[PDB]
Design a protein around this ligand. Sequence first.
Ligand SMILES: *C(=C)C1=C(C)[C@@H](Cc2[nH]c(/C=C3N=C(/C=C4\NC(=O)[C@H](C)[C@H]4CC)C(C)=C\3CCC(=O)O)c(CCC(=O)O)c2C)NC1=O
Ligand SMILES: *CC[C@H]1/C(=C/c2[nH]c(/C=C3N=C(/C=C4\NC(=O)C(CC)=C4C)C(C)=C\3CCC(=O)O)c(CCC(=O)O)c2C)NC(=O)[C@@H]1C
Ligand SMILES: C=CC1=C(C)[C@@H](Cc2[nH]c(/C=C3N=C(/C=C4\NC(=O)[C@H](C)[C@H]4CC)C(C)=C\3CCC(=O)O)c(CCC(=O)O)c2C)NC1=O
Ligand SMILES: C=CC1=C(C)[C@@H](Cc2[nH]c(/C=C3N=C(/C=C4\NC(=O)[C@H](C)[C@H]4CC)C(C)=C\3CCC(=O)O)c(CCC(=O)O)c2C)NC1=O
Ligand SMILES: C=CC1=C(C)[C@@H](Cc2[nH]c(/C=C3N=C(/C=C4\NC(=O)[C@H](C)[C@H]4CC)C(C)=C\3CCC(=O)O)c(CCC(=O)O)c2C)NC1=O
Ligand SMILES: C=CC1=C(C)[C@@H](Cc2[nH]c(/C=C3N=C(/C=C4\NC(=O)[C@H](C)[C@H]4CC)C(C)=C\3CCC(=O)O)c(CCC(=O)O)c2C)NC1=O
Ligand SMILES: C=CC1=C(C)[C@@H](Cc2[nH]c(/C=C3N=C(/C=C4\NC(=O)[C@H](C)[C@H]4CC)C(C)=C\3CCC(=O)O)c(CCC(=O)O)c2C)NC1=O
Ligand SMILES: C=CC1=C(C)[C@@H](Cc2[nH]c(/C=C3N=C(/C=C4\NC(=O)[C@H](C)[C@H]4CC)C(C)=C\3CCC(=O)O)c(CCC(=O)O)c2C)NC1=O
Ligand SMILES: C=CC1=C(C)[C@@H](Cc2[nH]c(/C=C3N=C(/C=C4\NC(=O)[C@H](C)[C@H]4CC)C(C)=C\3CCC(=O)O)c(CCC(=O)O)c2C)NC1=O
Ligand SMILES: C=CC1=C(C)[C@@H](Cc2[nH]c(/C=C3N=C(/C=C4\NC(=O)[C@H](C)[C@H]4CC)C(C)=C\3CCC(=O)O)c(CCC(=O)O)c2C)NC1=O
Ligand SMILES: C=CC1=C(C)[C@@H](Cc2[nH]c(/C=C3N=C(/C=C4\NC(=O)[C@H](C)[C@H]4CC)C(C)=C\3CCC(=O)O)c(CCC(=O)O)c2C)NC1=O
Ligand SMILES: C=CC1=C(C)[C@@H](Cc2[nH]c(/C=C3N=C(/C=C4\NC(=O)[C@H](C)[C@H]4CC)C(C)=C\3CCC(=O)O)c(CCC(=O)O)c2C)NC1=O
Ligand SMILES: C=CC1=C(C)[C@@H](Cc2[nH]c(/C=C3N=C(/C=C4\NC(=O)[C@H](C)[C@H]4CC)C(C)=C\3CCC(=O)O)c(CCC(=O)O)c2C)NC1=O
Ligand SMILES: C=CC1=C(C)[C@@H](Cc2[nH]c(/C=C3N=C(/C=C4\NC(=O)[C@H](C)[C@H]4CC)C(C)=C\3CCC(=O)O)c(CCC(=O)O)c2C)NC1=O
Lengths: 177, 177, 164, 164, 164, 285, 172, 73
Amino acid sequence: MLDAFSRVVVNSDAKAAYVGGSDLQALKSFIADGNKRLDAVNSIVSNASCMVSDAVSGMICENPGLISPGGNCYTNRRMAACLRDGEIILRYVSYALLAGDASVLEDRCLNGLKETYIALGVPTNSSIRAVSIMKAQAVAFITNTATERKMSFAAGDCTSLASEVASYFDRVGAAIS
Amino acid sequence: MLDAFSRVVVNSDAKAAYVGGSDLQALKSFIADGNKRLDAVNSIVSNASCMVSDAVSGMICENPGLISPGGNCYTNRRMAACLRDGEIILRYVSYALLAGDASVLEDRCLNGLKETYIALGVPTNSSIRAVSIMKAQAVAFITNTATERKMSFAAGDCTSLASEVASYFDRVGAAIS
Amino acid sequence: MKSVITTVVSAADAAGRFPSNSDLESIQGNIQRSAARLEAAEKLAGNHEAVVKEAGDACFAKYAYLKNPGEAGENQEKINKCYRDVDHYMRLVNYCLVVGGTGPLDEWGIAGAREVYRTLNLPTSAYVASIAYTRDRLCVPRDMSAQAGVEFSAYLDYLINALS
Amino acid sequence: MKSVITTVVSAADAAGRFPSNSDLESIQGNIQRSAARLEAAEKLAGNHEAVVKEAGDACFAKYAYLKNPGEAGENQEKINKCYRDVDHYMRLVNYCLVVGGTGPLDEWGIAGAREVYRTLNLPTSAYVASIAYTRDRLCVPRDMSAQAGVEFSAYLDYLINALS
Amino acid sequence: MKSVITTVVSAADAAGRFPSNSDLESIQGNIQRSAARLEAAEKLAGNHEAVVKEAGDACFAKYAYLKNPGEAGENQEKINKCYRDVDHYMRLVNYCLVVGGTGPLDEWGIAGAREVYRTLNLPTSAYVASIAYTRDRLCVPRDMSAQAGVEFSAYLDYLINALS
Amino acid sequence: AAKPYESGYIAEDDFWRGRGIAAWVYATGANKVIAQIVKDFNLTDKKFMVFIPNDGAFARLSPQLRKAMMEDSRLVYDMLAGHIFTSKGSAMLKDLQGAGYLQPAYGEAIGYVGTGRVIKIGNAQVIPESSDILRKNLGFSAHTLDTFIVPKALTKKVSIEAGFSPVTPAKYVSTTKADLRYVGATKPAAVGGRRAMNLMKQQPFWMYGPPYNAVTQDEYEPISAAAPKAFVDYQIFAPGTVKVSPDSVNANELNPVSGMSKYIGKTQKLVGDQGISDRSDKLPM
Amino acid sequence: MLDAFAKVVAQADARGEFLSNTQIDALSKMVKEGNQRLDIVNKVTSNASAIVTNSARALFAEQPQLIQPGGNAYTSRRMAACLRDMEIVLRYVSYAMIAGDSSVLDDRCLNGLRETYQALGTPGSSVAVAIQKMKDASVALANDTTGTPIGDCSSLVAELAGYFDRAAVSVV
Amino acid sequence: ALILAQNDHQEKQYIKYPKLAAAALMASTEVTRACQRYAVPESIEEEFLAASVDKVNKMRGTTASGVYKSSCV
Ligand SMILES: *C(=C)C1=C(C)[C@@H](Cc2[nH]c(/C=C3N=C(/C=C4\NC(=O)[C@H](C)[C@H]4CC)C(C)=C\3CCC(=O)O)c(CCC(=O)O)c2C)NC1=O
Ligand SMILES: *CC[C@H]1/C(=C/c2[nH]c(/C=C3N=C(/C=C4\NC(=O)C(CC)=C4C)C(C)=C\3CCC(=O)O)c(CCC(=O)O)c2C)NC(=O)[C@@H]1C
Ligand SMILES: C=CC1=C(C)[C@@H](Cc2[nH]c(/C=C3N=C(/C=C4\NC(=O)[C@H](C)[C@H]4CC)C(C)=C\3CCC(=O)O)c(CCC(=O)O)c2C)NC1=O
Ligand SMILES: C=CC1=C(C)[C@@H](Cc2[nH]c(/C=C3N=C(/C=C4\NC(=O)[C@H](C)[C@H]4CC)C(C)=C\3CCC(=O)O)c(CCC(=O)O)c2C)NC1=O
Ligand SMILES: C=CC1=C(C)[C@@H](Cc2[nH]c(/C=C3N=C(/C=C4\NC(=O)[C@H](C)[C@H]4CC)C(C)=C\3CCC(=O)O)c(CCC(=O)O)c2C)NC1=O
Ligand SMILES: C=CC1=C(C)[C@@H](Cc2[nH]c(/C=C3N=C(/C=C4\NC(=O)[C@H](C)[C@H]4CC)C(C)=C\3CCC(=O)O)c(CCC(=O)O)c2C)NC1=O
Ligand SMILES: C=CC1=C(C)[C@@H](Cc2[nH]c(/C=C3N=C(/C=C4\NC(=O)[C@H](C)[C@H]4CC)C(C)=C\3CCC(=O)O)c(CCC(=O)O)c2C)NC1=O
Ligand SMILES: C=CC1=C(C)[C@@H](Cc2[nH]c(/C=C3N=C(/C=C4\NC(=O)[C@H](C)[C@H]4CC)C(C)=C\3CCC(=O)O)c(CCC(=O)O)c2C)NC1=O
Ligand SMILES: C=CC1=C(C)[C@@H](Cc2[nH]c(/C=C3N=C(/C=C4\NC(=O)[C@H](C)[C@H]4CC)C(C)=C\3CCC(=O)O)c(CCC(=O)O)c2C)NC1=O
Ligand SMILES: C=CC1=C(C)[C@@H](Cc2[nH]c(/C=C3N=C(/C=C4\NC(=O)[C@H](C)[C@H]4CC)C(C)=C\3CCC(=O)O)c(CCC(=O)O)c2C)NC1=O
Ligand SMILES: C=CC1=C(C)[C@@H](Cc2[nH]c(/C=C3N=C(/C=C4\NC(=O)[C@H](C)[C@H]4CC)C(C)=C\3CCC(=O)O)c(CCC(=O)O)c2C)NC1=O
Ligand SMILES: C=CC1=C(C)[C@@H](Cc2[nH]c(/C=C3N=C(/C=C4\NC(=O)[C@H](C)[C@H]4CC)C(C)=C\3CCC(=O)O)c(CCC(=O)O)c2C)NC1=O
Ligand SMILES: C=CC1=C(C)[C@@H](Cc2[nH]c(/C=C3N=C(/C=C4\NC(=O)[C@H](C)[C@H]4CC)C(C)=C\3CCC(=O)O)c(CCC(=O)O)c2C)NC1=O
Ligand SMILES: C=CC1=C(C)[C@@H](Cc2[nH]c(/C=C3N=C(/C=C4\NC(=O)[C@H](C)[C@H]4CC)C(C)=C\3CCC(=O)O)c(CCC(=O)O)c2C)NC1=O
């Protein structure tokens, strides 16, 4: 499991080169932008339950065949398992946003999730819609463009973090796609 | 004298407009590439001593009549004054490129220069050529395409600053004409 | 206009020198500080209708005698021209936040003001009352950021010190 | 890799809970101490071949018996691989100065080293004596800053206590 | 208790190793953020009966049906224990502001609360609505500092997401 | 819309221009649309109430919602009619306590929940600090909001997948030195000559030793194969012209206790630099 | 196999919805570069043998063990296989560069290359070092004028380097 | 004239009109008596120190040959 700091270590260990000079610009900019990163992971973590419930309710209210008798989110057991399935993916994307690298998302969440949903008969398309709704909630919560709740931030620009979390969210969709 | 920032202020003061968000896209792009403007000015002032003796000797090689007896560059005193000119014009052009505005060029150097060179008997055709060779050296030094001196730069494009200094040099040439 | 640019190239022009490393080094601070001093520029430019409004009545609330006959604000058009002057001064402060120096203030509001305000009986204390009322009503996380507020207040008090 | 981030996300993953305030509070200190450890790592990166050369001869100066036949430093192939292994350890120390924790040491140089050095007849005291010599030639204002020297000597003592 | 110290000594004890540099690096951030969270906790401690009285009223105002017979807020004994439980939750939030983590919440108010509130017919939405009202009445410069408000609202959102 | 001071700030639009809450109302032209909504529903006589989203509320509209608002004028009209309420007269902040409903000028009834000083009109929170403003002429009361009132009925076609997902373009960070050198390795060897070996880089000093034996660039050039028959006598010259200097005068610098020496033997190859040469500037021939 | 234009359509059918105007001016900009992109692929396919041979020569002057007797680069059969394995990755990087999307690169070049190199005993890290040396020469050869109009190409050479790094991390 | 002017119009005026720039430099040295006709040395040290500068200034009153120019008469 590698963060942003360990990624340059593994990149320069293939070099057998010391890290210093050229490779330090990204790390010093990562340090100088760290308050916005903590400020963004806190904003995602504070609104987790509303995000998961809103994403699963949106996925159902766009496709009502899931709660249809014989659908994949039909009974209470399947609905609770789907809420859990969404909550775990949000947890791992929050880990990857905190670490600044998506290696923890690959190793513990996405490694084999593709055919696990296949063996379960879980529909692939619906989960992508839930992931995209969670992505759209995450960018609005980071950039303080949420219509239902406004938070308190110091003024400035952090759309790089919004692009990074959008870059994590589509990655998950691709693996299960 | 003015610079690039105050240029839009006299434009807004002509209509009593506040400088709004429309006006600041031109100026925040002036700041974004602020490192390239300093890197472009530093390349010119580094080889400014070669540039005058490059250009004036090129102007001699084309018209031997200047070093002819009675010619305008015939005396050591007149040759020193011509080399003194080759440097004043190069100094004010590097002021105008640093400021991002041509204002300091045409009230401190070119205002009253044409009738001075007419009253002195300084040849105008020969002058134009000393400025054009310096312009050709400026575009070579900004775009790092000199034959026998290459300077270390970060990679990227610089034809906009080269076009700006090319726009200052024919302002000089049209002024002395 | 006196700015970071026009200072260092006139010092170089007076000495006949090329732009040295100090001249380039001075403009590097114009890269760092322009993130803060430009953030107050659109903040004042977008909400410039409530600040003139809130300064103009504070000027007359401090000095109610100006509406007496024979005084400076006796009729309506004189008060209309009085609000226009606070709009002019806030526009010049908006300009000075953009150039980065006290150029436009010193050219367009400061030079020659002490003659016209004495000739036309305009009290300078009533001029600095509105600028001071703008100065103490700066909520440093709410109006703007911290450094943008510092850059804004440093240009307001320069006008206050120059008018008195 | 053992670091500041990885410990707290591994703890939150073992507990199965979201990142709380204590986790973010632990990253503020990473933000604080990165100003010292990164400029320790950069100064190590810029001058590493001088230090690897300087610490390599202290090993053979302390233990001159390694160049005898039958030992582990007979010909030039052994001395070259000795300098290579010392450079490997200095590179791992540079890596741990960057990542903030002892991860790259514990997994690329320390784990399994005892079986290799016992099997290949490599005396660990002379792999230790170079690291010990490197620590003592560190003055507080000359080589780096004050906290950078603390950050450097802490990883040197970690490597020494691991191999001893 | 879930905190900054306890997570890293529990991780080092599970690994069976000494405290490394990453552990101490995690405590530097505790030293940093204690300047904000302690003066959040002190301001909560000095004015808690005003906030609890205010919090209780909001729940009833939102859910006026609780005072009907057959419900959980019939007589004064239920409303007094409602205010007591809201004061308990505010005290646990004050405790988590001091310890630096969500330990006192997770063990004294959250764990087991769902079985109690389902068994004793206590609607969790009204135990949530008081905490939700407390969060929205927090202005940035008036009630506390800027980072203290962030530290306070983070624990309020943690309690809200735990009970919802 | 001409000047806010002329004749003070008594006129309706000038009074609001003098307030600092909603500058965006005149920055854009929503003032004309709201006027057309006060004539399309005859709201003039009956005493209504209006909720104004302040500055900052407008500055935080999502890009995909702002795009929809700027590509469909009926959407703007509906959203603006949803901020004007006739249900209960010109009510202040003391009449919204409890959880009830308000009737918009056009939209469907919108739920509100007021608990003391914390009042929600659905999706939006009222800013109590600057509100409860009753205008006698044109009687209505005004309140400020932290957010636009956005009903789920109007923002059903707005999606982030429609082209508003945030993307930051990545860029390379090469240098002029590196690119100039590497470009010489793109020509065929029969043309490039020496430059065909220009893609090799310096390696750690121990990579050039016995086990690995990395080759330097000076070993690919004719300078490392020069062994001429002729020689310089070094005796023909008058005494005092031949010069000799060592690299140092010290035992354990010319050769340390170990075999790692920079001056004696075959270990003077094991140096960090010296792995490449800048002798490819001469020519391509 | 998709191009960058087929990407947005394949994500538009999935939601069952028309391309909004923001996707359209995202695409007309991508058309409006156009000539630069083909100038890039023209420069790489004009010098392909030089790129491959100079990268292999730098690889063996650097790592002499592959051509040492017993090395993976020993003999002619293996050496010939190594010469144009690199030319295969160069070909598919140029395909992905002209497509604007790394869909052909993952489908028929990088799909299963790792266990292919594992089943043969080929060291994948040296393949990655060869990929990096081809990358450096390709981005060096990409940004010269050579009789093209002056402009910036930076967002295109970043994508070209990204294709090379995607190929380099997937092999090893 | 361009270094003693305060506002930009005042420097633009000396720029456009050369006699105005000749007169401003004179009036600037008259109201603050830095001319030589009002400069009083204090010690004989400073009197010699002023004599050296004045000897340099008289040399530009002759030609490059050494012939007296028509200015210093
Ligand atoms: C007479 C007939 C005649 C000359 C004398 C000579 C002068 C000349 N040079 C150029 C083009 C350049 N001159 C430059 C100036 C310098 N070159 C240097 O490297 C040093 C730093 C400096 C002088 C010491 C430069 C940089 C150029 C651009 C190309 C380059 O890489 O050098 C011109 C104009 C174009 C031309 O005619 O070549 C002239 C007239 N050339 C003569 O023909
Ligand atoms: C720089 C050379 C590196 C290297 C190459 C190498 N490869 C092989 C063997 C094979 N390579 C493949 C690869 C492909 N087949 C394909 O169809 C495609 C298209 C996507 C690729 C990339 C295959 C099938 C083989 C086995 C067949 C054969 O080559 O005879 C070999 C050795 C040959 C052998 O194993 O007998 C080498 C040397 N290895 C290196 O050392 C360099 C790093
Ligand atoms: C130690 C634990 C810790 C936290 C709990 C958070 C809290 C936090 N946020 C910021 C500070 C900030 N946070 C943001 C981020 C944003 N602002 C916005 O307007 C956007 C909505 C959003 C990004 C999209 C910005 C822009 C700053 C200003 C400083 C900076 O740019 O780094 C700061 C530094 C300045 C300050 O003290 O206020 C802190 C401590 N960050 C931490 O380090
Ligand atoms: C570490 C990462 C990790 C995960 C991502 C999940 C992945 C995962 N999900 C399920 C299991 C499931 N996941 C879902 C979820 C869904 N089905 C749908 O129709 C929706 C599209 C979606 C909810 C949004 C459902 C409904 C089940 C239960 C299937 C069943 O009961 O037959 C299972 C089988 C075990 C079980 O839960 O019973 C696993 C391993 N678990 C993990 O450990
Ligand atoms: C028919 C079923 C149906 C639903 C269940 C909702 C679900 C829903 N919510 C949002 C969109 C959103 N959802 C949230 C999440 C929240 N907003 C808040 O105010 C709370 C704090 C939190 C839990 C409710 C946010 C923050 C946004 C975007 C910005 C905003 O609304 O402020 C989106 C748009 C996602 C996208 O752009 O693709 C959808 C589909 N809408 C529907 O059409
Ligand atoms: C502030 C702006 C400023 C300038 C631009 C210069 C330009 C300039 N040059 C001269 C004066 C001169 N300028 C030239 C120059 C030339 N003659 C040629 O044939 C060539 C085309 C050209 C050189 C390349 C010569 C030869 C003289 C001397 C004339 C003489 O001595 O009779 C003079 C008159 C003063 C004097 O006699 O020295 C001025 C103002 N000086 C300035 O102060
Ligand atoms: C005080 C003195 C002082 C300077 C001299 C400049 C020095 C300078 N130049 C650039 C940086 C740069 N300079 C160039 C310019 C060029 N590159 C080329 O290939 C062209 C030949 C040339 C065009 C004219 C480019 C393209 C960058 C990188 C982009 C940028 O930083 O804007 C940078 C940013 C990168 C860095 O070094 O960290 C700096 C500090 N700035 C200063 O503060
Ligand atoms: C570019 C900068 C700039 C300014 C600062 C103003 C300054 C200024 N004010 C007035 C003119 C005036 N200025 C005022 C203003 C005031 N009287 C008071 O008692 C208060 C102190 C203040 C209002 C708050 C009044 C009342 C007049 C009219 C006086 C007259 O007409 O004689 C005039 C004369 C011409 C005119 O009527 O406009 C000028 C130049 N104008 C400018 O162009
Ligand atoms: C990435 C982490 C990493 C490391 C830390 C090193 C660790 C390491 N060092 C050696 C290997 C060695 N280390 C030494 C060093 C010495 N023996 C002596 O006589 C002196 C005591 C001392 C000189 C300083 C020698 C001589 C060998 C080679 C042993 C041999 O081949 O016989 C080997 C055996 C393989 C080899 O190098 O040939 C390994 C794995 N290598 C790594 O890859
Ligand atoms: C980045 C890693 C790094 C280190 C581990 C140290 C180690 C170190 N010391 C010296 C070099 C030296 N070190 C000293 C020691 C001292 N001089 C003083 O002012 C102090 C009183 C005293 C330290 C206690 C002296 C006197 C020299 C020069 C003579 C020598 O070679 O030892 C050198 C050679 C380069 C140089 O001249 O500095 C190196 C690499 N320095 C480093 O840069
Ligand atoms: C140290 C941590 C700690 C806590 C967090 C609280 C948690 C808690 N609250 C209640 C208990 C309660 N909580 C409420 C509150 C309400 N019911 C309503 O009608 C409204 C919805 C709401 C008012 C705000 C009521 C009425 C009881 C008493 C339930 C009863 O006795 O029937 C009880 C049952 C025992 C009792 O208080 O008599 C407990 C354990 N107590 C603790 O010791
Ligand atoms: C320690 C915990 C703590 C809180 C959770 C808050 C909550 C809070 N707010 C108020 C009291 C108030 N709070 C406000 C609100 C505001 N006033 C402003 O300047 C802002 C614009 C706006 C916040 C967004 C107002 C106007 C009052 C006085 C009227 C009232 O009782 O609500 C009071 C009564 C004591 C007081 O007068 O402050 C309390 C406890 N304050 C605290 O001390
Ligand atoms: C461009 C920069 C900029 C500013 C300087 C402010 C300026 C400002 N704020 C307010 C208006 C206000 N200003 C404040 C702010 C405060 N009140 C206090 O008692 C505290 C000292 C301070 C916060 C710390 C408040 C609470 C209001 C609304 C009520 C009031 O007028 O006090 C007004 C009156 C007109 C209006 O309502 O908009 C003005 C001009 N706004 C800006 O956009
Ligand atoms: C067979 C395929 C084929 C092509 C690629 C193009 C080649 C080509 N490219 C350009 C046009 C261009 N080519 C470039 C490219 C570059 N400029 C540089 O300085 C960099 C070295 C390089 C970037 C990689 C640029 C930047 C333009 C346009 C000039 C501009 O946009 O300002 C033009 C001029 C017409 C136009 O501008 O559209 C042509 C004909 N034509 C073809 O028929």
